[PDB]
């Protein structure tokens, strides 16, 4: 391979594949902080061309962290279909981009081809895509999973109901659930980040969620987003199991930062299969987001996009029901503004779909970043046209306890009625019987939690 190109008569040389992959990124505050970003637009473009010219082999054989050094690298590499890899290993990344985007490449074509990819190769493709490339490419790569709802079917759009409370007060939690359900939110999951990471508390929250599910016979699933170890404890001890959640990171060191062993995810699958109230075969929920590895000093000189792609590669091993990036969850140090957050969301979603996972996005931002609610509205609509599997919902997007702004319950109804998309078909049935939705639209009496009393 070449690590060198000339552009307008000036030679642009790079040290290694890693450097090329980093500098090819669109500018973000994260890559600058990590000190891996291009020096100018010229060198950004030169890196893109060098990358576009490397083969699948070139990139597959040069992972950011070495096989024998990193359990996540080993997981990713060990999961390759070597027959699919052998068909494409001599393709340039340029050629792989064009393949993904081609109207003559079908869903079934991509289904086999994607098995010959590693996360690094997935990343390389994302790096040479425009914003429209990322949206259109992602849209022609649907990924459908099933718990008690079916998510990911083209023409549909799901949503997590996020009824968080600063005190985990079951009244406040319930209040927001009735509100979200009235806007048709919750077909992805009813998921709470709890305050105490504690068996008694987890079951109490879970009991709260499932009290509403069981009372109205809602086709959905509940989740409490504490450490995977504590959710497993609670479910083993009798609490209702829906989805089992873990945050992940794309290196072994990253996982250690989070207190996560791979064997915990094995165990979560096993517990799911013994205990969980799930009809379909998918029951895991992962969450990701650009900058985690960097925060943990676990990026090993790699840009945050390449690292984020490694998360999806890890996730794919466990066939989760849903994954989402929490796109602007941390702050300006990794993603500074509107511009950069939109790009990252489009990148994250496209890479997730290319990796063949059930990829959603928490379109969100924080109050110390250069961002506002109009950003979340721009981004949610773009991602929806990309076939984004699901977004979040809270009352007006205000999390009273995680201290950021995500999408409103309003925003899911907006997206759905704007783009003629429907909920998960099972959930849509339930909304119709409750008189909340007719022909994909909120009825006159929707958006009113007192409807449930």
């Amino acid at each position: 391979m070449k690590l060198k190109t000339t552009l307008f008569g000036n030679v642009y040389q790079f040290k290694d594949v890693k450097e090329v992959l980093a500098k090819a990124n669109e500018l973000r505050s994260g890559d600058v902080l990590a000190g891996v970003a291009a020096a100018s637009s010229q060198e950004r473009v030169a890196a893109k061309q060098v990358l576009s010219e490397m083969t699948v082999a070139d990139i597959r054989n040069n992972p950011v962290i070495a096989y024998e050094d990193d359990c996540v690298t080993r997981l990713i590499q060990d999961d390759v279909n070597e027959t699919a890899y052998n068909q494409i290993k001599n393709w340039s990344i340029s050629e792989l981009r064009e393949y993904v985007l081609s109207d003559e490449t079908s869903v079934d074509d991509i289904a086999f081809t994607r098995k010959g990819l590693t996360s690094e190769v997935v990343a390389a493709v994302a790096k040479i895509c425009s914003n429209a490339d990322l949206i259109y490419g992602a849209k022609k790569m649907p990924v459908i999973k099933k718990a008690n709802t079916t998510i990911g079917i083209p023409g549909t759009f799901s949503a997590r109901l996020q009824p968080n409370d600063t005190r985990d007060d079951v009244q406040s939690i319930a209040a927001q659930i009735y509100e979200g359900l009235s806007f048709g939110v919750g077909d992805a999951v009813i998921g709470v980040n709890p305050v105490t990471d504690d068996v008694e508390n987890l079951s109490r929250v879970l009991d709260t969620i499932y009290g509403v599910i069981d009372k109205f016979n809602i086709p959905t699933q509940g989740c409490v987003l504490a450490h995977v170890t504590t959710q497993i404890e609670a479910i083993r001890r009798g609490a209702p199991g829906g989805l089992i959640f873990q945050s992940i990171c794309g290196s072994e060191k990253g996982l250690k930062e989070f207190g996560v062993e791979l064997a915990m995810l094995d165990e979560a699958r096993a517990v799911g299969a013994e205990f969980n109230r799930i009809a379909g075969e998918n029951c895991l929920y992962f969450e990701t987001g650009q900058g985690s590895a960097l925060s943990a000093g676990a990026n090993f000189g790699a840009d945050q996009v390449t690292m984020e792609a490694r998360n999806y590669g890890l996730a794919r091993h466990y066939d989760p029901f849903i994954v989402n990036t929490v796109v602007g969850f941390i702050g300006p140090e990794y993603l500074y503004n509107d511009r950069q957050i939109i790009r990252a969301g489009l990148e994250d979603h496209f890479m997730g779909k290319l990796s063949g996972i059930s990829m959603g996005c928490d379109c969100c931002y924080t109050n110390h970043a250069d961002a506002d609610q109009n950003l979340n509205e721009n981004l949610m609509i773009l991602l929806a046209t990309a076939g984004c599997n699901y977004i979040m919902g809270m009352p007006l997007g205000d999390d009273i306890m995680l201290n950021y702004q995500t999408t409103a319950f309003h925003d899911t109804a907006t997206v759905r009625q704007l783009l003629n998309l429907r909920p998960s078909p099972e959930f849509e049935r339930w909304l119709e019987s409750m008189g909340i939705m007719a022909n994909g639209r909120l009825t006159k009496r929707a958006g009113d939690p007192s409807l449930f009393f």
């Binding site: 307008f8 473009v45 061309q49 064009e98 393949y99 003559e104 040479i128 425009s130 259109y136």
Partner: protein, 252 residues
């Protein structure tokens, strides 16, 4: 081993299974526009995107690029400037680049001929390259034409950080019957050489409107050649003095 800025990169035809590839070569030759690059599904081919992005990097650079005062001093041109002090402020304050700074006025009254029939004024405006690349070729034959068959030729000068409307104040201070302005127009993706001329008969700040000007845009080797443009400007000038009118007040 392709340089994206190369002539080869520019002439690249990317249509996959073309109906008539000989026609595509003919078409690509017809135009400086980025035709015949084909597609991947509905999206641009990777090479076409790459060259676009390469050109864009070069384009941004031409926005902030400034002429040395060493270069204008060597042109034997007086240098004056608008109220603007720098490139960053120019981009954000149109109102300031439309006014002379308080020492500009005093330099022009002390160094330029009063009440000329035709005044040439030159500015970098939005693209330095437009005047640097074009200058030796347009400027001399222009002011040759004006004296050679003509009359009172004013003394030419450079306004830094100028915007077109600054030529109304200039015409008032010097009492020019006609004012002609060569100014860089905003740079395009693949080109920053494009020069325009904005000319007015007997302008006044408080009365003259944009439609009172005649425009001749896209001056450069790839549009209307500088030598040739200089002759059309000389012609325009003398028609303005005959007609006591410019732009939208000039016959046919």
């Amino acid at each position: 081993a392709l340089d994206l800025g190369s002539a080869e990169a520019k002439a690249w035809i990317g249509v996959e299974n073309p109906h008539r590839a000989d026609v595509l070569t003919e078409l690509r030759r017809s135009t400086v526009a980025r035709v015949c690059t084909g597609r991947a599904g509905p999206r641009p081919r990777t090479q076409a995107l790459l060259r676009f992005l390469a050109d864009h990097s070069r384009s941004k650079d031409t926005v902030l690029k400034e002429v040395p005062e060493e270069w204008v001093k060597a042109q034997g041109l007086l240098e004056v400037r608008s109220e603007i002090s720098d490139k960053n402020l120019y981009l954000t304050r149109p109102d300031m680049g439309r006014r002379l700074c308080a020492e500009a006025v005093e330099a022009l009254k002390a160094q330029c001929v009063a009440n000329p029939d035709v005044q040439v004024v030159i500015s970098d405006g939005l693209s330095t390259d437009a005047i640097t690349v074009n200058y030796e070729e347009i400027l001399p034959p222009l002011m040759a034409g004006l004296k050679q068959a003509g009359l009172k030729v004013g003394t030419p000068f450079f306004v830094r950080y100028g915007r077109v409307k600054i030529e109304d104040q200039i015409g008032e201070i010097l009492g020019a019957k006609v004012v002609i302005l060569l100014v860089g127009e905003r740079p395009g993706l693949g080109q920053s050489e494009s020069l325009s001329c904005y000319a007015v008969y007997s302008p006044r700040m408080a009365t003259t409107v944009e439609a009172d000007r005649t425009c001749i845009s896209n001056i450069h080797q790839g549009g209307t050649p500088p030598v040739e443009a200089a002759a059309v400007i000389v012609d325009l000038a003398k028609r303005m003095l005959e007609q006591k009118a410019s732009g939208i007040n000039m016959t046919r």
